[PDB]
Ligand binder design. Structure first.
Ligand SMILES: [Mg+2]
Ligand SMILES: [Mg+2]
Ligand SMILES: [Mg+2]
Ligand SMILES: [Mg+2]
Lengths: 83, 160, 49, 55, 120, 177, 41, 86
RNA sequence: GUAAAUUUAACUGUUAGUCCAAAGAGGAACAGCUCUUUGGACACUAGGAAAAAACCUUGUAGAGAGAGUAAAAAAUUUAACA
């Protein structure tokens, strides 16, 4: 009955060794979210605009100001995509 | 009535962490073997899907899978297009289980095959050693050898 | 890999943590009695030669 | 083909409609969508973990 | 001023308490000292750095063997505080000619003649 | 996984709203756990370049307590800029004027001194009382536990615990008390 | 046939994710009736 | 980490020093053929080989020095008998 | 136990030296003070002590998105009386 961690949020975990004791194996099927643990489904100018979207996105006003042409040209237009 | 070493309930009477007790070893041995054999027939029946693997090679680890590229900072003296079987694996794992070693897994358990595809001279890495107000400066450019491997496929054996 | 394993399979890293936590209780059981007891099942070591 | 998953090249319309159609071929009931977890609902970055349950 | 420090020989006389601790039996004493460097050669007198070089331990974490005799004892005594010392003991007899290549060292000072590289 | 590219990447680097009750907690320990959660160190995918920080909400910042006489010993000093503008205020006086203050400048020291500091600071939220607007109260995720246990008072200790606890000594009857 | 330049990383994985990539809600439980903290209904 | 624990059992404090983590071959042919030894493994074996040849040289010299004294003492006891016999 | 040493042939440059530890001298048993002797560092890289020349770890150089270690984080609260 003893368990090392609560097996109720991520996966039902159990460890196991071969009888010789040279390799360790694990069995961790993911938990099933019960139905009880769910819910039913159902202009302006620079000053006012930069602060209201900052209050909307929860960030500062600095990054929203426009940068110079020096940085706009240095931005890469064909960046490499992974996968 | 009370043991001599007994103490009433306080904050420092017992440690803050909760007391625990480990299970008995005999039923654990039957639990160690039972959970292994159901995993053994699981892989024999083929319930698993992908299987990733960790590898010790060239004095450093990598997490790898099948159909994935990998680079090494030296030459192995292998012709391009040749296949090789890697010996060392720290662990391999599927969607619902994992096979960890002590430290590595057995030879007969796994068969990790990988093909060599490509070999570059590394891009020119420049180095400059400089010291101030003493006219000590120097340059050097290195192009170390590199090789590109790819793990074609990984498989596991029923032996366990 | 220990970090990268936690990125993509937390279920695996949970087994590593569960494996690690069990060794602590085995080590604390060894702290109570060093010898004169059956050693930990996971604390058992492999001897190379 | 290893790189791109199914719905990258094979785009589809009304996926849940196609889902309920396929589930009737497989002889099971009509599932219901239920938000399991939520974060930032009133925030401009809403986030919902919707799960489809049948029976 | 600072000079070479002569050590009393009485300090290097093992008592029965020390014998039971390190398990070194006085009779049947070992022959060879496994030597390894830990402390840096720098910030030491000229006589301390050249001796360890004369012993051949400029490299750290490099086990190197010396004799257990009073002559070489004086050398690594004055620079004893730069190195580790561990005795040599082996169960498998001296290394035979056939097993010259398959040798292997251990952290416990052992030197196994045979090394087949897999567990029991 | 079997998740699409953009939705999976969105859920990984998404933000979450923590909640904490400051009743009988020290401002340091709640600041220690908060600061690591503000950069996103708790995320295994942490990277300082990627602003993967998460919001934090504190309640009952008025009902905080120090360990020691730091209500009197500790001093919070600042300088306006003018001559004589250097002033000092005890933690008690600073608490009477602003109960939101003690934590906000306490976390301010914990997190690093970068330009991401002020972004993470405003992301954090504070309230002296347990009354919250429905907007910021609805977008919640999880309430992490408190660092320290709160000791119970004599009126709180039930009778069966006192009876279980054994009396220790005999009082002589000849005593006024 | 590709230009020798710096490589962003020394390997490439086409299917790096097994068992589901980590999101914040992997390692925490759910709530009875699906309730946020300090919520009646 | 764990260096003090590894040397407790006799293992290397650094696992890269010796043991199966490095001494085994790091690659082999797909057909099961054995790969050639690595440069690190070759110089390590040559180091241990000269180390073994050195230790055998050190031991036999000490044994030759010990017996050479006792052979001199037997000669010493011999000539003392010669003195009283004369 | 080690491999350097003496001599020969031909030159160059250093010959304006600060600090630490110790034995001393002058001075105030003053100086980041001055003058000698033994040793070390610095005027050669790197890590730590906050930034640090001289303190503490560490030398023979490279690639690595490998690993194990070295030195390495200040502790203190004080006074009753027939
Ligand atoms: Mg001076
Ligand atoms: Mg001076
Ligand atoms: Mg001067
Ligand atoms: Mg080196």
């Amino acid at each position: 009955t003893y368990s090392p961690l609560p097996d109720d949020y991520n996966c039902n975990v159990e460890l196991a060794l071969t009888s010789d004791g040279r390799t360790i194996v694990c069995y961790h099927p993911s938990v099933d979210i019960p139905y009880e643990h769910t819910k039913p489904i159902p202009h302006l100018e620079e000053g006012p605009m930069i602060e209201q979207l900052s209050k909307m996105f929860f960030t500062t006003k600095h990054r929203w100001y426009p940068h110079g042409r020096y940085h706009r040209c240095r931005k890469n237009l064909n960046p490499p995509k992974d996968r | 009535s009370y043991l001599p070493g007994y103490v009433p309930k306080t904050s420092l009477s017992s440690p803050p962490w909760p007391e625990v007790v480990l299970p008995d070893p005999v039923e654990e041995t039957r639990h160690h073997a039972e959970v292994v054999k159901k995993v053994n027939e699981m892989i024999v029946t083929g319930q698993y899907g992908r299987l990733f693997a960790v590898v010790h090679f060239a004095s450093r680890q990598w997490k790898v899978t099948s159909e994935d590229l990998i680079l090494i900072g030296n030459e192995l003296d292998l012709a391009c297009g040749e296949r090789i079987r890697l010996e060392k694996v720290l662990l391999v794992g599927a969607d619902n289980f994992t096979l960890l070693g002590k430290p590595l897994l057995g030879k007969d358990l796994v068969r990790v095959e990988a093909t060599v595809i490509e070999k570059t001279e590394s891009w020119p890495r420049i180095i400059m050693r400089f010291r101030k107000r003493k006219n000590f400066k120097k340059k050097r450019i290195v192009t170390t050898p590199q090789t590109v491997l790819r793990i074609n496929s990984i498989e596991i054996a029923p032996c366990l | 890999v220990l970090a990268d394993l936690a990125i993509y399979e937390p279920k695996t890293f949970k087994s590593l943590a569960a494996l690690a936590s069990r060794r602590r209780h085995e080590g604390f059981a060894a702290a109570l009695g060093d010898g004169k007891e059956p050693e930990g099942i996971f604390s058992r070591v492999v001897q190379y030669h | 083909m290893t790189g791109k998953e199914l719905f990258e090249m094979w785009k589809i319309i009304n996926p849940m409609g196609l889902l309920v159609e396929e589930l009737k071929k497989r002889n099971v009931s009509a599932p219901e969508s239920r938000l399991t977890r939520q974060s930032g609902g009133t925030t401009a970055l809403p986030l919902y973990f919707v799960g489809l349950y049948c029976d | 001023k600072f000079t070479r420090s002569r050590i009393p020989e009485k300090v290097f006389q093992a008592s029965p308490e020390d014998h039971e601790k390190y398990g070194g039996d006085p009779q049947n004493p070992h022959k060879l000292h496994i030597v390894t460097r830990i402390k840096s050669t720098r910030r030491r007198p000229y006589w301390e750095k050249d001796i360890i070089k004369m012993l051949g331990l400029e490299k750290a974490h490099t086990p190197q063997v010396h004799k257990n005799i009073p002559s070489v004892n004086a050398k690594l005594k004055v620079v004893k505080h730069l190195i580790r010392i561990k005795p040599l003991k082996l169960p498998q007899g001296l290394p035979a000619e056939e097993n010259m290549s398959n040798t292997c060292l251990k952290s416990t000072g052992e030197l196994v003649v045979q090394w087949h590289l897999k567990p029991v | 996984s079997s998740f699409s590219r953009a939705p999976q990447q969105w859920a990984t680097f998404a933000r979450i709203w923590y909640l904490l009750d400051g009743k009988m907690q020290p401002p340091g320990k709640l600041a220690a756990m908060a600061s690591i959660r503000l950069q996103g160190l708790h995320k295994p995918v942490y990277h300082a370049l990627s602003d993967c920080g998460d919001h934090v909400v504190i309640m009952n910042t008025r009902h905080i307590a120090f360990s020691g006489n730091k209500w009197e010993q500790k001093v919070y000093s600042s300088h306006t800029g003018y001559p004589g503008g250097f002033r000092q205020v005890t933690a008690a006086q600073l608490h009477l004027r602003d109960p939101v203050a003690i934590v906000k400048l306490a976390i301010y020291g914990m997190l690093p001194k970068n330009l991401h500091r002020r972004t993470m600071m405003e992301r954090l939220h504070l309230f002296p009382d347990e009354y919250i607007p429905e907007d910021i109260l609805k977008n919640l995720v999880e309430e992490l536990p408190q660092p320290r246990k709160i000791p119970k008072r004599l009126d709180e200790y039930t009778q069966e615990e006192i009876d279980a606890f054994p009396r220790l000594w005999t009082p002589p009857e000849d005593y006024r008390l | 046939g590709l230009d020798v330049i710096r490589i962003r990383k020394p390997f490439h994985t086409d299917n790096p994710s097994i068992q589901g990539q980590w999101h914040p809600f992997t390692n925490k439980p759910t709530t009875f009736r699906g309730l946020r903290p300090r919520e009646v209904q | 980490a764990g260096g003090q624990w590894r040397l407790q059992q006799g293992l290397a404090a650094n696992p890269s020093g010796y043991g199966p983590l490095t001494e085994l071959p790091d690659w082999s042919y797909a057909d099961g053929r054995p790969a050639p030894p690595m440069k690190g493994q070759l110089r390590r074996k040559a180091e241990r080989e000269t180390f073994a040849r050195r230790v055998v040289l050190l031991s036999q010299e000490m044994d030759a020095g010990l017996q050479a004294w006792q052979l001199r003492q037997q000669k010493l006891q011999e000539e003392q008998r010669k003195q009283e016999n004369a």
